[PDB]
Amino acid sequence: TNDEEKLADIVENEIEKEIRKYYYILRDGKIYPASDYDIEVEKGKRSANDIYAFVETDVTRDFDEFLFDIDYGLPSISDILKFYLEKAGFRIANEVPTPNLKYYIHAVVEFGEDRPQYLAVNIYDIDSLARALRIPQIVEQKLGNKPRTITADEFNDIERIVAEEQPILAGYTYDEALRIPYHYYVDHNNSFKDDALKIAHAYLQLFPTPYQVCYEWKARWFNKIDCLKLERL
């Protein structure tokens, strides 16, 4: 929890810095835009082994979408699978592995006009997330326990099972589980209530609850705020 609080302030300080004018957080706490860092790795300047946390920032202007991204803003299946496989020792084709990645961070910023209103930082433990998605079992069944370089075809075959085949939430495949609550919460379509609540109930029980830190934009800076106060708005 102390590491997670430190990580949320690192993200908040960076979003704030970016406002007034994708990321990796290294094991030393330094934050860099991921695109640039990937080029520095490709040059041999920086090491992919130093990446501790991956940050995905989403920006919104609709409050319902903001709350929905906070509550359902899980990392991409491709990302969790890639992060799991690499953390387990497997290598995906010619791609540079990130074996020491512990956290996936989803930061959501809500805007007023051209100026911001809120920031919500969600910190997920990658291992916990991979387990809830049944990724270890599926990888073991398909590839075995001994790590090696896998083909893009093998990665895709695993990805398909995890996201589009297995009923993971209230009998729905993962992709269906993403769509239905969007239709209810963001599209404000009431006929989707029953199914969204069923998915919500399963998701809140089965999926790991993230370390959540919230902030309000007040006079050119972010100020800490209670997340439970936020959900009421």
Residue numbers in the entry: 25 to 45, 58 to 269
Q: What does the report in the manuscript say about this coordinate set?
A:
Acidianus two-tailed virus (ATV) infects crenarchaea of the genus Acidianus living in terrestrial thermal springs at extremely high temperatures and low pH. ATV is a member of the Bicaudaviridae virus family and undergoes extra-cellular development of two tails, a process that is unique in the viral world. ATV is the fourth most abundant of these proteins. Remarkably, ATV displays a new protein fold, consistent with the absence of homologues of this protein in public sequence databases.
Two crystal forms of recombinant ATV were obtained belonging to the tetragonal space group but with different cell parameters. Crystals of the first form diffracted to 3.85 Å resolution and included one monomer in the asymmetric unit. The monomer A from this model was then used to solve the structure of the first crystal form by molecular replacement. Refinement against these data produced a new model, at 3.85 Å, with R and R factors of 27.1% and 29.5%, respectively. Remarkably, these interfaces are not conserved in the first crystal form, which actually displays less extensive contact surfaces, the largest masking 608 Å2 per monomer, none of them considered as significant by the PISA algorithm.
